[PDB]
Amino acid sequence: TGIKNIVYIEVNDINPLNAGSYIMDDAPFFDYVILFAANIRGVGSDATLYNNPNVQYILDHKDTLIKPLQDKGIKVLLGLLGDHTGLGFANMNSAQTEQFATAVANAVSQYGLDGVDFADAWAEYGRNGYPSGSTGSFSNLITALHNKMPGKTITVFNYGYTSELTGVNSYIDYGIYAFFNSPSWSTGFGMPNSKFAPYTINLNSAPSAASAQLYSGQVASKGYGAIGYYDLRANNIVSVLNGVAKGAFKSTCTYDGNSYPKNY
Amino acid sequence: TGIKNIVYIEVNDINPLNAGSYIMDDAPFFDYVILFAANIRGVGSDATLYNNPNVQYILDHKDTLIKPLQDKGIKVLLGLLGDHTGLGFANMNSAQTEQFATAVANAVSQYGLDGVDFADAWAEYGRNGYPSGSTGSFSNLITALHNKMPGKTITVFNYGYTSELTGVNSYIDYGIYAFFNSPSWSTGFGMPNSKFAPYTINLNSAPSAASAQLYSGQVASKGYGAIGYYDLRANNIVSVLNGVAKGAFKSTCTYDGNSYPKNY
Ligand SMILES: CC(=O)N[C@@H]1[C@@H](O)[C@H](O[C@@H]2O[C@H](CO)[C@@H](O[C@@H]3O[C@H](CO[C@H]4O[C@H](CO[C@H]5O[C@H](CO)[C@@H](O)[C@H](O)[C@@H]5O[C@H]5O[C@H](CO)[C@@H](O)[C@H](O)[C@@H]5O)[C@@H](O)[C@H](O[C@H]5O[C@H](CO)[C@@H](O)[C@H](O)[C@@H]5O[C@H]5O[C@H](CO)[C@@H](O)[C@H](O)[C@@H]5O)[C@@H]4O)[C@@H](O)[C@H](O[C@H]4O[C@H](CO)[C@@H](O)[C@H](O)[C@@H]4O[C@H]4O[C@H](CO)[C@@H](O)[C@H](O)[C@@H]4O[C@H]4O[C@H](CO)[C@@H](O)[C@H](O)[C@@H]4O)[C@@H]3O)[C@H](O)[C@H]2NC(C)=O)[C@@H](CO)O[C@H]1O
Ligand SMILES: CC(=O)N[C@@H]1[C@@H](O)[C@H](O[C@@H]2O[C@H](CO)[C@@H](O[C@@H]3O[C@H](CO[C@H]4O[C@H](CO[C@H]5O[C@H](CO)[C@@H](O)[C@H](O)[C@@H]5O[C@H]5O[C@H](CO)[C@@H](O)[C@H](O)[C@@H]5O)[C@@H](O)[C@H](O[C@H]5O[C@H](CO)[C@@H](O)[C@H](O)[C@@H]5O[C@H]5O[C@H](CO)[C@@H](O)[C@H](O)[C@@H]5O)[C@@H]4O)[C@@H](O)[C@H](O[C@H]4O[C@H](CO)[C@@H](O)[C@H](O)[C@@H]4O[C@H]4O[C@H](CO)[C@@H](O)[C@H](O)[C@@H]4O[C@H]4O[C@H](CO)[C@@H](O)[C@H](O)[C@@H]4O)[C@@H]3O)[C@H](O)[C@H]2NC(C)=O)[C@@H](CO)O[C@H]1O
């Protein structure tokens, strides 16, 4: 397949509809949009899925804040992030793993989402009486979600206990390099180049169009399958994306004019 | 990197040591020798690696039948072939893929081999209740094996479900054109010319030396990186190989006199 553009939107600040305002070759520039993020939270022995008031609002208003992206062909994923309780993706027991995977699959079904993204950061492993080290639950969680959501996408931000995931990487559609604005010509957890983004642009502290065209052209020539983006804002950042369009796609990217505020 | 000579030996018939008897520029003429072939066999739900008595004899006698080739700098790969059970590289489920990848990696480690060659032929897909069509496992099998045996070689004979392998071709060192004694100036699964043999000689039903020199010169001048060979026997076939040496390498090939019988 062609190179996919995968964007994480910090929905505490930014209306995710802005991802749809960018066009390349009569199609959306962005292929995947990650609502960053819902949280795993340990609560006693339970492994819970927690949506903060901004995420919950977007899910509660899926017809107006998610579906128009999906109407254009964009796949919308629920981002998943640690949240300082001491329990994260990599230190659950068998019951907690099954419980968390059930919650996530039910949320993806209930809100008509296209899958999920895993970002193993900020769990603060070991706090509040949970194990301080890995139990092996991270691979089992991927496996459980693959069995529960056939046909849906799983992406992994390459940070935290991801080195453990090599054995289940056939269940993972894309991996994403964790540092911004400079490429690293490798992949994590054994992913082939065609399933990895070795270059990830911070669109808030944005690099120049010249740098984006330089590196995006190298993404294509070296045969990688994706480019990552983090923290798209509500300003028109097409200068940078047009650099990527010229570099990786031999094309151009334009703005449709729609700037969507976060009135919630 | 110069042109590599890659030879498949039908070890049901031929002692593989014969590949070491040919010399070009004070080095082995052949760079890779494939022991053709171990098999994938479905047994119930298991995906198994089966070595027939000739293959198993060679592996059990690695010090006398494999190591002398490796001492000369020749790389020796285990050939992998379907075997009429209905299960093959391209129709496994995830557990079978992991299971077969593990069995192959372990044999490569146990017998001190330099890697493997995949020939997706003779599986008879769909026999014995196995899936009749592709599951997508061929690409995952290459990924799983690359991750399990780092620093080893993977070659792919361009026959069977190989059109699926474009996404993992960075894990494949060489692809081999599947038909004999006439070049086809293209490659499979997105491979660059430098990683492909577009010309494969049958050394049993051998072409003329003049033919071999004509076509091998075109291999070099068109920028390809390998030439393939099938069914080297125990007779002195240097006349053909010297034709290739004159064509592709602007040199000569000689025989060292050693004819090794299959007394096993
Ligand atoms: C160090 C380093 O660098 N590191 C790195 C990393 O970082 C990375 O990662 C990646 O990347 C990215 C970027 O970087 C990231 O992101 C980021 O993050 C961060 C962090 O976060 C986290 O944490 C936090 C905190 O927490 C704490 O606190 C809180 C409050 O208080 C609480 O609550 C909690 O719980 C905690 O606490 C606890 O703990 C502690 C400690 O232990 C203790 O002490 C206590 O006591 C307790 O216990 C948090 O908050 C978060 O979370 C949140 O969010 C999320 C999303 O993100 C979600 O999911 C969740 O849910 C949450 O949300 C919710 O909540 C909140 C709170 O409450 C609210 O607000 C909301 O609304 C909701 O409701 C986490 O966990 C951070 O910080 C950041 O942020 C930033 O950015 C953003 C975007 O843009 C924004 O929005 C914000 O605001 C901020 O801003 C800032 O910065 C920026 C940038 O530049 C700018 O623009 C602005 O302007 C600002 O600035 C300012 O400030 C700064 C500082 O602050 C300075 O510098 C400047 O100058 C100025 O001043 C971000 O977000 C991420 O994560 C990642 N990514 C992915 C995964 O994809 C890595 C990799 O790359 O690497 C490393 O190296
Ligand atoms: C058609 C066409 O053409 N096609 C093509 C193809 O072929 C190709 O491919 C490629 O190339 C090459 C060449 O061609 C190849 O190779 C070949 O192959 C073939 C086949 O094989 C396969 O199959 C077989 C059969 O099977 C069956 O049977 C058996 C017995 O009985 C059984 O066991 C089985 O199972 C099966 O059965 C089953 O199934 C069936 C069907 O379905 C049914 O019916 C039944 O009932 C059952 O169920 C087989 O056998 C094989 O296998 C084997 O081998 C392998 C190696 O190769 C291994 O791996 C395995 O393991 C095995 O071995 C084992 O076993 C056996 C048996 O038992 C024994 O014996 C041994 O020892 C061990 O143990 C497969 O699978 C074949 O046939 C061929 O062969 C031939 O050659 C060789 C070499 O040189 C030799 O050695 C032999 O012997 C033969 O010989 C012959 O021929 C030749 C020439 O070649 C000559 O020289 C001689 O002399 C002879 O002749 C004779 O005969 C003929 C006929 O045969 C006639 O013609 C004449 O005249 C005379 O008489 C070969 O091998 C390959 O494969 C590939 N390559 C690669 C690299 O891959 C493609 C491509 O090119 O194309 C297409 O087109």
Author numbering:
A (entry chain A), B (entry chain B): 43 to 79, 80A, 81 to 201, 202A, 203 to 225, 226A, 227 to 306
Paper excerpt:
The genomes of Bacteroidales contain genes encoding glycan-degrading apparatuses that typically co-localize in discrete clusters known as polysaccharide utilization loci (PULs). B. thetaiotaomicron contains almost 300 different GHs belonging to 60 different GH families, and secretes at least six mannosyl-glycoprotein endo-β-N-acetylglucosaminidases (ENGases, endoglycosidase hereafter) that hydrolyze the chitobiose core of asparagine-linked, or N-linked, glycans (EC 3.2.1.96). Here, we discover an ENGase from the GH18 family in B. thetaiotaomicron, BT1285, encoded in a distinct PUL with its own repertoire of proteins for catabolism of the same HM N-glycan substrate as that of BT3987. Altogether, our data suggest that human gut microbes employ evolutionary strategies to express distinct ENGases in order to optimally metabolize the same N-glycan substrate in the gastroinstestinal tract.
To better understand the molecular mechanism by which BT1285 specifically hydrolyzes N-glycans, we solved the crystal structure of a catalytically inactive variant of BT1285 (BT1285D161A-E163A; hereafter BT1285i) in complex with the Man9GlcNAc2 substrate at 1.9 Å resolution. We found one molecule of the Man9GlcNAc2 substrate unambiguously positioned in the active site of the enzyme flanked by the following connecting regions: β1–α1 (loop 1; residues 52–57), β2–α2 (beta hairpin; residues 78-94), β4–α3 (loop 2; residues 123–135), β5–α4 (loop 3; residues 161-178), β6–β7 (loop 4; residues 199–204), β7– β8 (loop 5; residues 218–240), β8–α5 (loop 6; residues 243-250), β9–α6 (loop 7; residues 272–282). We observed no substantial conformational changes in the protein backbone for the unliganded and glycan-bound forms of BT1285 (r.m.s.d. of 0.4 Å for 271 residues). For example, Man (−5) forms hydrogen bonds with residues E166 and R169 in BT1285 while it is exposed to solvent in BT3987, and Man (−9) is exposed to the solvent in BT1285, but it is in close contact with residue N403 in BT3987, These observations are consistent with the degrees of flexibility displayed by Mannoses within the crystal structures of both ENGases bound to HM-N-glycan, as evidenced by the B-factor values. To further investigate how BT1285 specifically recognizes HM substrates at the molecular level and how it compares to other HM-processing ENGases such as BT3987, we performed an alanine scanning mutagenesis analysis of residues that decorate the β-barrel core of the enzyme and contact the Man9GlcNAc2 N-linked glycan substrate. E52A from loop 1, H126A from loop 2, and E166 from loop3 drastically reduced the hydrolytic activity against IgG of the enzyme (at 37 °C, pH 7.4). Simultaneous mutation of two non-catalytic residues, Glu52 and His126, both of which engage the N-glycan core, completely abolished BT1285 hydrolytic activity, indicating that together these two residues are essential for HM substrate recognition.
